[PDB]
Amino acid sequence: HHMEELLKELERIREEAKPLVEQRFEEFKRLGEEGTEEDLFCELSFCVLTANWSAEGGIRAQKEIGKGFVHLPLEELAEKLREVGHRYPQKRAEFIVENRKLLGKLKNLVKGDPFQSREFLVRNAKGIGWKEASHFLRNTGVEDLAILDKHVLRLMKRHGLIQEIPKGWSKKRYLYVEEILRKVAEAFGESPGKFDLYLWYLVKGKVDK
Ligand code: NA
């Protein structure tokens, strides 16, 4: 399959998807602009939980646990994650509890240079790698970054943009594949952060987060 085929299909869904994409982005921008440290922490926790899980699951976990991500002890947090169906509740709970060290630092991170903020989160936030750090930043309104998850990587491979799907990341390799996708986003006329939502609309016609 060729790149033009992908762009044409995206153009066919663009008009219908746009209101959903724009409304979802307004919510992301609201979080970055008006969100408290705890609000940002809950979004970081959403990204920990959806590393290898559906947006639907993470949204349900966020709804059910809420500020529990901030205050619950490890055992109680793990139990609530087990209750909402997470497959790895103990380890994700441990990541979230450890990440509480970042409360007080998130507002500045979200406002900082997004490439530098992503580097920080990769190194310092548990359960957050290159993809999940990009995801968190995008979900606070950042538009500069791609979220290279399995769905996006498979689309890129199917349309000849990359030759193989990476099963792990480094700074240089993530930046490289991200730049490939940035050029596609630019060809379409959208920022990487919004382009991601158009790409995901292709699957089932949904715009989650
Ligand atoms: Na990390």
From Swiss-Prot:
Give the E.C. number(s). Answer: 3.2.2.-, 4.2.99.18
Q: Which GO terms describe its molecular function?
A: class I DNA-(apurinic or apyrimidinic site) endonuclease activity; hydrolase activity, hydrolyzing N-glycosyl compounds
Q: Report disulfide bridges, numbered on this chain.
A: none
What the entry lists under InterPro entries is as follows: DNA_glyclase/AP_lyase_Ogg, DNA_glycosylase, HhH-GPD_domain, HhH_base_excis_C
Q: Where is this site: Important for guanine/8-oxoguanine distinction?
A: 209
Keyword Calcium present in the record's keywords: the answer is no
Q: Does the keyword Transferase apply?
A: no
Single GO biological process annotation from the record = base-excision repair
Which Pfam family, just one, is annotated for this protein? Ogg-HhH
Family membership: Belongs to the type-2 OGG1 family.
NCBIfam families listed in its UniProt record: PRK01229.1
Name the job this protein performs.
Answer: Catalyzes the excision of an oxidatively damaged form of guanine (7,8-dihydro-8-oxoguanine = 8-oxoG) from DNA. Also cleaves the DNA backbone at apurinic/apyrimidinic sites (AP sites).
* Name of the featured protein: 8-oxoguanine DNA glycosylase/AP lyase
Annotated organism of origin: Thermotoga maritima (strain ATCC 43589 / DSM 3109 / JCM 10099 / NBRC 100826 / MSB8)
The major lineage groups are: Bacteria, Thermotogati, Thermotogota, Thermotogae, Thermotogales
